[PDB]
Amino acid sequence: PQFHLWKRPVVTAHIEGQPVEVLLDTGADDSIVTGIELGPHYTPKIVGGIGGFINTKEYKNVEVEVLGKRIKGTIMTGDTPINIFGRNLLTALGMSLNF
Amino acid sequence: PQFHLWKRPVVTAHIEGQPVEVLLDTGADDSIVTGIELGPHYTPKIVGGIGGFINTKEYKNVEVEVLGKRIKGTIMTGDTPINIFGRNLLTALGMSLNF
């Protein structure tokens, strides 16, 4: 199936049972989410974007249900203005950019 | 043809004859380039990203050759750390995100 990019490529995902709207982003290396609580077992990180950088919390082997499939992967949480699924999860969902 | 996303989706483009490496990004609304000079006929803009926002110069109807095709479109220039082609040009190149 595919996304024709006249609108933002947005889907609903469940992270450890919690539902979240996410943007599927090929220019992101990694994924970052806000407004979800995931535990004390994290490593501190900083990710850089366009306007500067932010502090994040990296969680490994998190359970994610999206597009009729359940995968486990790395998620960061931090003060992002929008939630992003980056290339790390898009490869796990078998997505490609086609032309 | 397609890009499998284990590596960054990067191509070379010619903007008004000048060659530039660009990242094809589905989470960008628009495109922004640096290190190219495009004229005094621009409108001032500010784009926001992850770490904050930047000042840009918006140029309309610019000539772009990429993936064996020549298209005209809107490009901004500013102090981006990487050059991005956003959804505005990816639709004009007939790209979709497939799964």
Binding site: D29, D30, G48, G49 | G49
Partner: peptide, 4 residues
């Protein structure tokens, strides 16, 4: 664009 997002990176670590």
């Amino acid at each position: 664009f997002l990176e670590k």
